[PDB]
Amino acid sequence: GSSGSSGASIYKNKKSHEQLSALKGSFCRNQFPGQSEVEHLTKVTGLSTREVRKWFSDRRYHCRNLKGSRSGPSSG
């Protein structure tokens, strides 16, 4: 029972906001998807389960160590 396939290489392709927006609506609320979220998106976008989950990775990457304007809200 293996899930994490072998060969995780960031890709690049043209997408239609129409679908993009949907995906986001899931992230903004929940950091990372689980089982239900995906099942839904996969239908809201049609993209393969792998494609749907993959995206999430992108958004995160794009927004990494992007601090400066704020002071730094620690976890406490």
Side-chain angles (χ1 to χ4, degrees):
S2 199
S3 292
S5 286
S6 195
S9 182
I10 302 166
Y11 293 102
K12 71 186 283 165
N13 172 74
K14 176 155 176 157
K15 281 206 209 278
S16 298
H17 198 277
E18 283 73 39
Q19 288 160 253
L20 204 155
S21 54
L23 286 171
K24 284 167 81 276
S26 302
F27 199 110
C28 56
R29 284 163 86 84
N30 207 17
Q31 279 71 254
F32 53 112
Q35 291 80 240
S36 287
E37 273 315 297
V38 182
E39 275 270 283
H40 174 59
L41 293 155
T42 47
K43 293 176 173 270
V44 196
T45 66
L47 304 154
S48 303
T49 315
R50 180 194 89 198
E51 274 288 314
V52 179
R53 291 192 83 166
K54 175 87 279 202
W55 174 88
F56 284 80
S57 305
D58 284 322
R59 270 286 175 170
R60 275 173 172 203
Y61 270 135
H62 187 209
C63 271
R64 206 88 189 281
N65 44 88
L66 57 160
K67 70 270 150 80
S69 192
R70 292 87 90 168
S71 60
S74 58
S75 68

